[PDB]
Amino acid sequence: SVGIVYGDQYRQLCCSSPKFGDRYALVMDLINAYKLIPELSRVPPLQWDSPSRMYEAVTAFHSTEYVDALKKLQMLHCEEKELTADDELLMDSFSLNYDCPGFPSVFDYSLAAVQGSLAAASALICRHCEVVINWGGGWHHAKRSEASGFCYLNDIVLAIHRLVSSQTRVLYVDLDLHHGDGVEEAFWYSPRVVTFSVHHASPGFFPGTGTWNKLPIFLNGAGRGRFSAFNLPLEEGINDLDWSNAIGPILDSLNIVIQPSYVVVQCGADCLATDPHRIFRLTNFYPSLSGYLYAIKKILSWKVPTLILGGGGYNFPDTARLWTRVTALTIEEVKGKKMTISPEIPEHSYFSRYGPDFELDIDYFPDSIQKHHRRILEQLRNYADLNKLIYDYDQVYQLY
Ligand SMILES: O=C(NO)c1cn(-c2ccccc2)nn1
Ligand SMILES: [K+]
Ligand SMILES: [K+]
Ligand SMILES: [Zn+2]
């Protein structure tokens, strides 16, 4: 079946942050308004038997002292008093400041995404679901002991760790506008988790990595993980077709050579033309075919158990518009069952958020890459050689 993570408490927690507001409620209620929920298997978020078990799960990646600080941050923000100078310094040492501030539910909010993505990994491992979707997860920037880009706990890394520890190889595909630095870093030394991020990069643009680092070079992993971290940085303004042609052959080549046991896709919605970032010009169109839907369709065609996660996306109605279509496409491709979606937003609780036109399409009128393809193809060959993987070089070369 196709699973999707939700629950009443889960929804409350995912809607408790100052930055993402009620975005999760709009996403799930649009999916419900299009009558998709009966097609989906609800996957409940993971809960634990004790504080000690919870800490064991989260500190599989994060440090105990970072988790301690994040829990303390929530406790401090549940009291009226200002933080002490010592406590401010403590939070600063974990980057729990500026773009990752405290708020009264910051620990429960961050933990909830972990609970959802770990439950999603488990549903794939026991084969209850072929694909599981978690639109409350996808927080790819968080590091072992550092919050980053309103990511506090890295649910993706923890989900992948549960998958790889279930010859298991995971392919991670990061479609967010931003480089997936936290996930890349976590698996920098691991050949069994191959990471691939497509993103914008330019001087001063967050987080700064995923690009050229004497002709400067692309770093791509270290130790036994050399050549196992893949990146495609793209110039601003790219449209659905050029983004699809840029990543399409890379995705197919990675699947052929790696033969992954699981695929984990981060589907951050900030590449939409209507995102306030206004960097890329992707759409959610489904006849100009949405780059997101193109990539998800291709990944799902491999018939590999797959985890689909959220991420960025600061236009909340248009994020719901895109992820609703991703969800319908996943049902269609997995179950072989057509999903008809009206071009008009159905009546429901959040209908007013989709004005003034109330349509499902977002409101938008639509050399360098060749060199990246040759570089990435050589890195894939180097990865295959280093890791004793066999494949016909010319079936792969033909893809490009
Ligand atoms: O959407 C994102 N990444 O997925 C993001 C964007 N943020 C950002 C932080 C500082 C400056 C500019 C942008 N932090 N995270
Ligand atoms: K990305
Ligand atoms: K890796
Ligand atoms: Zn982003």
Numbering used by the authors: 2 to 167, 177 to 223, 229 to 302, 315 to 393, 402 to 435
Task: List sentences from the manuscript.
In eukaryotes, HDACs, which belong to the epigenetic machinery of the cells, catalyze the deacetylation of ϵ‐amino groups of lysine residues in histone tails, leading in consequence to a more compact chromatin structure, which usually results in an inhibition of transcription. In contrast to hsHDAC8, showing in humans the lowest level of expression of the class I enzymes, in S. mansoni smHDAC8 is the most abundantly expressed class I HDAC at all life‐cycle stages and was validated as drug target for schistosome‐specific inhibitors. The active sites of the enzymes consist of a long narrow tunnel, accommodating the incoming acetylated lysine side chain of the substrate, which leads to a cavity containing the catalytic Zn2+‐ion. The active site residues of the two enzymes are highly conserved, with only M274 in hsHDAC8, being substituted by H292 in smHDAC8.6 The replacement of this hydrophobic residue by a polar one modifies the physicochemical properties of the active site, which could be exploited for the development of smHDAC8‐specific inhibitors.
In this study, initial screening revealed the triazole‐based hydroxamate 2 b (N‐hydroxy‐1‐phenyl‐1H‐1,2,3‐triazole‐4‐carboxamide) exhibiting potent inhibitory activity toward the novel antiparasitic target Schistosoma mansoni histone deacetylase 8 (smHDAC8) and promising selectivity over the major human HDACs. Due to the promising biological activity of the 1‐phenyl substituted triazole derivative 2 b, the compound was crystallized in complex with smHDAC8. The structure reveals that compound 2 b binds in the smHDAC8 active site in a straight conformation, its capping group pointing toward the solvent, whereas its hydroxamate moiety forms a bidentate interaction with the catalytic zinc ion as well as hydrogen bonds with the side chains of histidines H141 and H142 and the hydroxyl group of catalytic tyrosine Y341. Interestingly, the triazole ring of 2 b is observed almost stacked between the side chains of phenylalanines F151 and F216 that form the active site tunnel normally accommodating the aliphatic part of the incoming acetylated lysine side chain. Yet, the F151 side chain is observed in two conformations, one turned toward the active site, participating to the tunnel mentioned previously, and one turned away from the active site. This suggests that the stacking of the triazole ring between the two phenylalanines observed in the structure is not absolutely essential for the interaction. In addition, the nitrogen atoms of the triazole ring are not facing the smHDAC8‐specific H292 side chain but turned toward the Cα carbon atom of glycine G150. Finally, the capping group of 2 b does not appear to make extensive interactions with smHDAC8. Yet, the rather small size of the inhibitor allows it to fit nicely into the smHDAC8 active site pocket. Replacement of smHDAC8 H292 by the somewhat bulkier human methionine M274 could potentially explain the increased IC50 for 2 b measured with the human enzyme.
